[PDB]
Design a protein around this ligand. Structure first.
Ligand code: DGD
Ligand code: CLA
Ligand code: CLA
Ligand code: CLA
Ligand code: CLA
Ligand code: CLA
Ligand code: CLA
Ligand code: CLA
Ligand code: CLA
Ligand code: PQN
Ligand code: SF4
Ligand code: SF4
Lengths: 80, 94, 340, 74, 220, 33, 143, 159, 220
């Protein structure tokens, strides 16, 4: 399964959560930014590794990172 | 399953996924009794896969090697050998 | 991608076709494999048999024969058409059908009957192979434009996009534009083989000179039948033999064709740089060059960037096609002008 | 003689590419910045833009003028 | 350790054909294997290097044996400018008779290949003259190839495994390899040239049965 | 005896068969221990 | 707090003629997925597996092979139509696991009670070099 | 004439006249590979006989010895060698797939849903019986075709 | 002519060094990917964001450099062979006059020295060069096959493979046989490797056939 991590430069814009095609990420309360929220990745066994979340992030450098790992049926997107 | 436009079930889950044998048949043996008895006698030793594998491999290799060794010159040009005087190379090379 | 909409403009036939695309594509895949084997493997078998000193085991007119009987039958029907099925016509539509007769103008052959044999059978099934493969690629592109088992929401990504990421095992070249990009190469292959077949057959069996007594001498003297049944024959008797005019043209009025021959080889090889590589390397290199320009106060406001992924593929295929086609153009024109 | 010269030149080319491959592997897997502070190996990483740009200039000069002379003669 | 590959659990749980390909491609990347330590890396590398030596010796011995068995070294010795040396005989059941005739060359009685590696000139320059010498060389190299495997097996047992600090003694290794592997080998080869090859280039045949009596130089 | 006639088939046909059989059966094992 | 609903196996399916893009043998041996929703009226929609279908008025239940297909269909149902949906994973033994929406609220709206997973409280530029974790089995990105 | 398979469109296929006509179902249910209530030995014997009988022709008519007085023997030997290779491959597949004592993985449901006993063929012992039968029948079928073609010399068409 | 070809060889050395050095010095990161060292030596890419990041790892720089290495060594060996072949025939003026323009290289080296090689077998018979002639064509084939892996990428092939899996699971008398490793298309890095390998093998075999046949047909 792939690994997904969130770093504390997040501004809580929620774009990565909206971009994910298999519902890996979600927003949770926080106090470190003006939006009072931060992203989280509790369901990485369903991650396919597409990196749309990285494409959506506006900070420099990124606040969400994806490291590809061992492959499974779910992570290879096999319907057979 | 199949009633009132329903194809899902938590009990008969096999039919929901469609685990069927479309062409599988359940009919008795149509072979003759004496023929079946004959074919059930002389085909016994080959029914053990571990022994059959070694028998097939070793016997096949032995047969192939022997047939290669005993092949007749009138059938294999490589066995026959050259029959013409050699042609010379460039610059008088032999 | 842009206009299909079953909520406002429904069509039953399009839906029915979209509902058995797996069956369609799988059967086309299989027939491509079958044709490729039983057409190109025959040439491979002939090359092997000829190299091993066993010419009596080849597929040829003097050996195992594969005659194109249906084509010969249609030719015979067309050649004898004047008189029974078309009583109002004096002669047939073409001199190639048959009915032994030759027309000569200025001591040169115009047209005459064209015979068909094992070599024609082989090359026609090669043409069938190339065309069916081109159809496979382009039809796959059109039919799976909106979705597939791999990318369920492909229509939201558009007609022209590079990929959808390294996940799912890797998803480079899933867009329809990439299917067109791949189809251009196979189209080039097919048409090149068509024009090579035409050139060799016409030079070997039709064009030539005729004497006062009526002895026809052909340009390559009827070597197509025996030599075109191996790949070594195409390499030796067609490319190497007929390239002499274009490569000896320097110092005469045809030297421009030699210059274009070389320049087109250059462009073709140039395209491979774009085809084989990727844009991350080139952007990283541009960063170093921009540092040097910044050192001397000459960094432009319009910030340099490497070509996009799609533009890289487009530039590659464009220069590949231009180089190959121009090479063949120069070859043909020098050969036919000098020897014809 | 032809075979020997060609054979050993191709083998040499493959070896030369491998040298830089394993050298690149060194920088990722084993290099420790803290224990190499301000030595020659770190300063190499420090002026990489200058190094790469001057190599690029040399390649451009050679390519332009050599290809140009060949085309002029043709 | 569940299934192939035993050295990678991440690959071993992969349910696709990708398990097989990658299993082949990462076999010799010891650093990436599961539960590897620094010491085992060096020890396994040592064993693998012994394996490479064994394979090299086998390759050379095969060349010598085949040249001796099927070549024309003795014939080539007497007319080196007009005779083509023979690499090995050809036995191909797919051949036709014209190929059988065409590939019979060099004075042989069957189809052959001509050698372009230059081993005939090399082996003639260093004093070899007959097929018996070639056979003895091939057998000796066969012995060395077995010695390499036995040593590799021995240095991989618990009693005979070198420690990690042994592999990192740079000064001692440099001394031994400069003095012994380069210099002494050169001394031994110079001795061979003085005792064997140079006399052979003058009509004198020195072998293992008479080399003590003959003097390389009259004044010793 | 003609040694090539016996040894060429053994190395070109039978040995590959045995080796490929063993490797296929090895890579298909559900558990190795 | 939130009690996920129970999967009713007697829900009708949309009106479809069939295709070659649906379930294969994996659903028999490993797992498959089920999406349910409610429609105000019967209407046409594009299937994620190719072609078109007609959803009925009332409850609708559809079986799919992968989670991504369920989410894509749900996003179409939420953007183009004003319809709420849910989906589940089903095992060969008949076990059902409720998947989405997990706690009754959409993931892009911040909701209390959620516990963070996989958060590193530093900037990405402060990860260590690989040599610092060599021969240990750890990752430089793991906290 | 095209309908969903068993009324279930959402399975990954749709019934056609090809895959649902009773004429095809009768023929496919009368084949040795689908006689679930017959011992694997005889089912393998029939398969081996038929395939060994058919494999004789190509080797005897297209080989490198086709224009020699011993072409029939060469063709028969080629058929026997191919049968040996196929039997080896069958044994390897059986060893790789089925473990000793494991239950049959054959489907246990019919079109109507009625449960049926699983096929013994998908087991470690049934597959071995089928393989032995295939080898024996293949050799016998090759020998029979050779005997009919080049011993009695029956009057065929282009033999 | 020697002046011109030596400056071409210098171009080859400088460009190959540029590619490899840029790969090595940017391995740990750059402006486009400042955290590259976390992802290792070989990885496919970093996705289509930030403009697109195809071929960004150091492994990919090695992959690009191998092409330029083959180009440079080809120039070196072409020059050696043509100069010596005109030396051995006693016709140095041929090289001295034809080498100053590129059509001279195409016509007087490549085209002229192939005539014997491509007649190893023909409609009239065969001779001892036939194997080399066969090998020549073999090379041209493998080279070209490599292009397929280098130009077309993975997502095209995976979609195709899914359809074949559907077809096998639906075919009678053949669905009684099941696979145990699920078939998938090759990985991105794997495809780059396979394509480069076919390219290199074809390169080598083609040139070896031409060199050996051309020289031994004239001199033995
Ligand atoms: C005769 C043929 C003999 C061989 C037949 C089989 C070939 C099969 C090749 C498959 C390659 C697959 C691949 O994609 O394999 C990928 C591999 C390695 O990828 C690895 O992939 C790994 C994947 O992870 C997996 O593996 C990891 C390590 O075990 C972990 O366990 C992890 O959990 C697990 O998921 C990791 O990401 C590693 O970091 C990563 O390096 O790449 C490599 O092997 C690349 C390095 C190999 C050498 C490259 C240079 C040499 C070739 C140049 C051209 C040669 C020309 C020859 C001319 C001859 C002329 C006569
Ligand atoms: C080094 C490997 C090798 C060897 C030794 C052979 C040997 C042979 N090949 Mg070749 N072949 C090879 C590789 C090899 N091939 C490869 C890799 C390919 C694919 C590219 C081919 C493709 C090929 C074709 C297409 C043909 C041959 C044929 C032949 C035969 C030509 C001689 C003859 O007149 O036979 C005449 C002999 C016969 C007609 C009867 C042979 C009967 C055999 C010996 C029975 C063996 C039985 C035994 C149980 C087998 C055990 C196998 C295994 C379990 C160990 C000969 C047996 C020809 C042939 O005749 O094939 C049958 C033929 O048509 N080969
Ligand atoms: C010379 C180069 C070359 C070759 C040989 C191929 C071959 C193939 N391509 Mg590829 N392709 C190439 C270049 C090439 N391509 C390039 C440059 C590109 C980039 C533009 C592509 C892009 C491309 C696409 C997009 C597609 C193909 C497809 C195909 C397949 C066509 C089906 C077929 O004929 O199967 C029959 C197989 C052959 C003709 C291969 C030769 C077999 C020989 C003659 C016999 C071998 C005998 C025996 C098995 C030997 C065993 C030896 C033993 C030791 C192992 C086939 C595997 C299509 C496909 O998959 O169709 C199904 C397809 O969709 N190609
Ligand atoms: C494949 C069948 C075939 C084809 C393609 C043709 C085609 C033709 N026929 Mg023929 N014809 C055929 C079979 C065919 N015929 C047969 C079986 C018979 C019975 C003997 C005839 C009897 C026939 C007559 C009597 C005439 C034609 C004529 C024609 C021409 C008619 C043109 C038009 O505008 O109408 C055309 C070239 C006409 C003609 O000669 O036009 C020049 C005409 O007068 N045909
Ligand atoms: C003394 C020499 C030496 C040694 C001990 C090593 C050792 C190592 N190298 Mg290095 N390397 C060398 C030379 C060496 N290398 C050279 C000369 C090159 C330049 C080509 C490289 C380029 C290189 C790369 C690019 C990489 C390594 C890597 C590796 C690791 C092994 C990877 C593996 O298991 O591959 C398994 C082997 C294979 C999959 C086989 C590949 C064979 C290729 C594709 C060609 C085969 C074609 C075949 C012969 C065709 C025959 C056809 C026939 C008709 C003739 C290991 C640390 C890897 C590493 O450390 O990554 C972190 C890595 O990525 N090496
Ligand atoms: C024949 C093919 C070919 C050619 C000509 C080039 C040329 C170049 N490559 Mg490329 N490359 C190729 C194939 C080729 N490559 C292949 C197959 C690969 C493997 C994937 C690569 C991989 C590669 C890499 C990785 C790198 C290069 C680099 C370079 C540059 C080297 C320096 C040089 O010579 O600058 C001189 C420039 C030229 C000779 C280009 C042509 C200039 C023309 C003739 C000028 C006149 C144009 C004309 C007036 C325009 C008319 C057209 C229109 C307006 C009507 C150069 C631009 C390196 C680079 O960028 O260095 C800075 C580099 O890093 N190449
Ligand atoms: C004097 C003592 C001595 C000697 C003779 C050796 C010898 C050797 N050691 Mg070393 N070693 C020693 C002490 C010694 N060691 C000590 C004390 C330590 C501990 C500190 C080590 C630790 C050690 C390790 C850890 C390893 C070795 C290894 C090796 C082998 C290197 C591979 C090889 O064969 O290169 C052969 C090299 C040469 C013959 C010299 C190079 C010649 C060049 C190429 C020029 C040739 C010019 C010539 C004219 C060409 C002729 C060509 C011909 C065709 C005509 C070699 C057998 C390695 C090995 O493989 O072990 C199995 C290895 O891994 N050693
Ligand atoms: C790496 C070394 C090598 C290589 C590349 C070859 C290559 C060849 N050998 Mg040779 N051979 C070798 C070593 C080698 N041999 C050795 C050491 C011996 C024992 C003295 C032989 C004995 C031998 C015979 C008897 C024959 C060949 C033949 C052949 C040819 C066909 C292959 C075959 O049948 O092999 C057969 C291989 C063997 C019988 C065994 C090889 C040696 C093993 C691997 C020793 C392992 C030792 C190690 C410690 C464990 C081919 C040219 C055949 C030939 O000439 O056909 C025309 C043939 O008839 N070889
Ligand atoms: C390469 C293809 C090939 C060739 C050359 C042959 C050749 C032959 N077959 Mg065979 N056959 C083949 C493929 C082939 N078959 C296939 C694919 C099948 C399955 C559809 C069969 C099924 C078959 C049967 C059922 C019979 C033959 C028989 C024959 C023989 C007589 C054929 C006749 O008279 O008409 C002849 C030796 C006949 C025979 O051997 O009678 C004794 C016979 O009864 N063949
Ligand atoms: C070479 C190459 C480049 C680099 C090539 C570039 C950037 C093209 C540069 C084109 C011209 C030379 C740019 C300058 C144009 C100016 C208008 C020129 C002004 C001066 C004239 C008037 C003389 C890529 O960016 C790339 C991207 C993706 C895949 C492959 C590749 C690839 O192979
Ligand atoms: S890589 Fe794709 S699937 Fe994974 S978390 Fe990011 S957007 Fe979601
Ligand atoms: S390699 Fe390029 S095309 Fe392929 S997934 Fe990565 S960014 Fe997209």
């Amino acid at each position: 399964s792939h690994s997904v991590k969130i770093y504390d430069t997040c501004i809580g814009c929620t774009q990565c959560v909206r971009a994910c095609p298999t519902d890996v990420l979600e927003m949770i309360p926080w106090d470190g930014c003006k939006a009072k929220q931060i992203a989280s990745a509790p369901r990485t066994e369903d991650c396919v590794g597409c990196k749309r979340c990285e494409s959506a992030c506006p900070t420099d450098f990124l606040s969400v990172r994806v490291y590809l790992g061992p492959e499974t049926t779910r992570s290879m997107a096999l319907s057979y | 399953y199949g009633e009132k436009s329903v194809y899902f079930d938590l009990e008969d889950i096999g039919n929901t996924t469609g685990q069927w044998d479309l062409y599988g048949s359940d009919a008795p043996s149509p072979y003759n009794g004496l023929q079946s008895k004959f074919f059930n006698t002389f085909a016994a030793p080959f029914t053990k896969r571990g022994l059959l594998l070694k028998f097939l491999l070793l016997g096949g290799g032995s047969l192939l090697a022997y047939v290669s060794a005993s092949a007749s010159p009138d059938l294999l040009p490589i066995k026959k050998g050259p029959q013409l005087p050699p042609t010379p190379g460039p610059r008088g090379k032999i | 991608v842009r206009d299909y909409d079953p909520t406002t403009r429904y069509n039953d036939l399009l839906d029915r076709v979209l509902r058995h695309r797996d069956a369609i594509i799988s059967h086309l895949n299989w027939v491509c494999i079958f044709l490729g084997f039983h057409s190109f493997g025959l040439y491979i078998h002939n090359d092997t048999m000829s190299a091993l000193g066993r010419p009596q085991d080849m597929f040829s007119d003097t050996a195992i024969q594969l005659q194109p009987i249906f084509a010969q039958w249609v030719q015979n029907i067309h050649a004898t058409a004047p008189g029974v099925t078309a009583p109002g016509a004096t002669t047939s539509t073409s001199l190639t059908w048959g009915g032994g007769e030759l027309v000569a103008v200025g001591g040169k052959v115009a047209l005459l009957p064209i015979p068909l044999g094992t070599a024609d059978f082989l090359v026609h099934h090669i043409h069938a192979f190339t065309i069916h493969v081109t159809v496979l690629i382009l039809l796959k592109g059109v039919l799976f434009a909106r979705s597939s088992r791999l990318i369920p929401d492909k229509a939201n990504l558009g007609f022209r996009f590079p990929c959808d990421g390294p996940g799912r095992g890797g998803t480079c070249q899933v867009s329809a534009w990439d299917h067109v990009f791949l189809g251009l190469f196979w189209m080039y292959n097919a048409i090149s083989v068509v024009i090579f077949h035409f050139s060799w057959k016409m030079q070997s069996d039709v064009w030539g000179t005729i004497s006062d007594q009526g002895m026809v001498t052909h340009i390559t003297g009827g070597n197509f039948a025996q030599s075109s049944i191996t790949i070594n024959g195409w390499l030796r008797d067609f490319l190497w033999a007929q390239a002499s005019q274009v490569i000896q043209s320097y110092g005469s009025s045809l030297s421009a064709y030699g210059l274009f021959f070389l320049g087109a080889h250059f462009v073709w090889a140039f395209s491979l740089m774009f085809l084989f590589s990727g844009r991350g390397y080139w952007q990283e290199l541009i960063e170093s060059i921009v540092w040097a320009h910044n050192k001397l106060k000459v960094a432009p406001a319009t910030q340099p960037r490497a070509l996009s992924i799609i533009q890289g593929r487009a530039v590659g295929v464009t220069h590949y096609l231009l180089g190959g086609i121009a090479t063949t153009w120069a070859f043909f024109l020098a050969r036919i002008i000098a020897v014809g | 003689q032809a075979a020997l010269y060609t054979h050993h030149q191709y083998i040499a080319g493959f070896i030369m590419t491998g040298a830089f491959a394993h050298g690149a592997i060194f920088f990722i897997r084993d290099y420790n910045p803290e224990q190499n502070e301000d030595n020659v190996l770190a300063r190499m990483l420090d002026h990489k833009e200058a190094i790469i740009s001057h190599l690029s200039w040399a390649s451009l000069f050679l390519g332009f003028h050599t290809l140009g002379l060949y085309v002029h003669n043709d | 350790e569940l299934r192939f590959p035993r050295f990678s659990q991440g690959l071993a749980q992969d349910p696709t054909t990708r398990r097989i390909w990658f299993g082949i491609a990462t076999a010799h990347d010891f650093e990436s294997h599961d539960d590897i330590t620094e010491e085992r890396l060096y020890q396994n590398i040592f064993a693998s290097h012994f394996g490479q030596l064994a394979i090299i010796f086998l390759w050379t011995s095969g060349n010598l044996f085949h040249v001796a068995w099927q070549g024309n070294f003795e014939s080539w010795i007497q007319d080196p400018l007009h005779v083509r040396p023979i690499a090995h005989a050809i036995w191909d059941p797919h051949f036709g008779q014209p190929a059988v005739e065409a590939f019979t060359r060099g004075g042989a009685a069957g189809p052959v290949n001509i050698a372009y590696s230059g081993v005939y000139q090399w082996w003639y320059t260093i004093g070899l003259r007959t097929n018996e010498d070639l056979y003895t060389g091939a057998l000796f190299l066969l012995f060395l190839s077995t010695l390499s495997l036995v040593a590799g097996w021995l240095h991989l047992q618990p009693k005979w495994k070198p420690s990690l600090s042994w592999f990192k003694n740079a000064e001692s290794r440099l001394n031994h390899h400069l003095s012994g592997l380069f210099g002494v080998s050169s001394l031994a080869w110079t001795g061979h040239l003085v005792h064997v090859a140079i006399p052979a280039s003058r009509g004198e045949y020195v072998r293992w049965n008479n080399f003590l009596d003959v003097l390389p130089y009259p004044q010793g | 005896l003609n040694l090539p006639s016996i040894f060429v088939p053994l190395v070109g046909l039978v040995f590959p068969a045995i080796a490929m059989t063993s490797l296929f059966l090895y890579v298909q094992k559900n558990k190795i221990v | 707090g939130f009690v996920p609903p129970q999967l009713d196996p007697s829900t009708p399916s949309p009106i479809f003629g069939g295709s070659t893009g649906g379930l294969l043998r994996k659903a028999q041996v490993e797992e498959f997925y089920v999406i349910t929703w409610t429609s105000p009226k019967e209407q046409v929609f594009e299937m994620p597996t190719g072609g078109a279908a007609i959803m009925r008025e009332g409850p609708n239940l559809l079986k799919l092979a992968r989670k991504e297909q369920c989410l894509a269909l749900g996003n179409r149902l939420r953007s183009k139509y004003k319809i709420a949906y849910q989906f589940y994973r089903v095992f060969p033994n008949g076990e059902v696991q409720y998947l989405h929406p997990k706690d009754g609220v959409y993931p892009e709206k911040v909701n209390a009670g959620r516990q963070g997973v996989g958060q590193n409280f530093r900037s990405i530029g402060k990860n260590v070099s690989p040599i610092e974790v060599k021969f240990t089995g750890k990752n430089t990105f793991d906290v | 004439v095209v309908q969903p398979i068993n009324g279930d469109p959402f399975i990954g296929s749709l019934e056609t006249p090809v895959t649902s006509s009773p004429l095809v179902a009768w023929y496919l249910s009368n084949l040795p590979a689908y006689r679930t209530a017959v011992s694997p030995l005889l089912r393998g014997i029939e398969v081996g006989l038929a395939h060994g009988y058919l494999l004789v022709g190509p080797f005897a008519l297209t080989g490198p010895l086709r224009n020699t007085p011993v072409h029939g023997q060469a063709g028969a030997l080629g058929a026997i060698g191919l049968v040996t290779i196929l039997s080896v491959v069958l044994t390897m597949y059986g060893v790789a797939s089925f473990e000793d004592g494991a239950p049959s993985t054959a489907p246990s449901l019919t079109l109507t849903g009625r449960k049926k006993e699983a096929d013994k063929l998908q087991t470690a012992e049934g597959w071995a019986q089928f393989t032995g039968g295939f080898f024996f029948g293949g050799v016998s079928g090759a020998i029979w075709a050779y005997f009919l073609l080049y011993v009695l010399d029956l009057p065929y068409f282009f033999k | 002519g020697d002046f011109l070809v030596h400056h071409a060889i210098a171009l080859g050395l400088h460009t190959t060094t540029l590619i490899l050095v840029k790969g090595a010095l940017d391995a740990r990161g750059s402006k486009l990917m400042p955290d590259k060292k976390d992802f290792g030596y070989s990885f496919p890419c970093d996705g289509p964001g930030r403009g697109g990041t195809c071929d960004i790892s150091a492994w990919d720089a090695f992959y690009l450099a191998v092409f330029w290495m083959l180009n440079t060594i080809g120039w070196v060996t072409f020059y050696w062979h043509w100069k010596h072949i005109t030396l051995w025939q006693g016709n140095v003026s041929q090289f001295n006059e034809s080498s100053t323009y590129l059509m001279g290289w195409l016509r007087d080296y490549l085209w002229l020295n192939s005539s014997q090689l491509i007649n190893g077998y023909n409609p009239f018979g065969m001779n001892s060069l036939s194997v080399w002639a066969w090998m020549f064509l073999f090379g041209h084939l493998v080279w070209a096959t490599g292009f397929m892996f280098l130009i077309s990428w993975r997502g095209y092939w995976q979609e195709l493979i899914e359809t074949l899996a559907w077809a096998h699971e639906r075919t009678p008398l053949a669905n009684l046989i099941r696979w145990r490793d699920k078939p998938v298309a090759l990985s991105i890095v794997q495809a780059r490797l396979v394509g480069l390998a076919h390219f290199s093998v074809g390169y080598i075999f083609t040139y070896a056939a031409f060199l050996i046949a051309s020289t031994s047909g004239k001199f033995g």
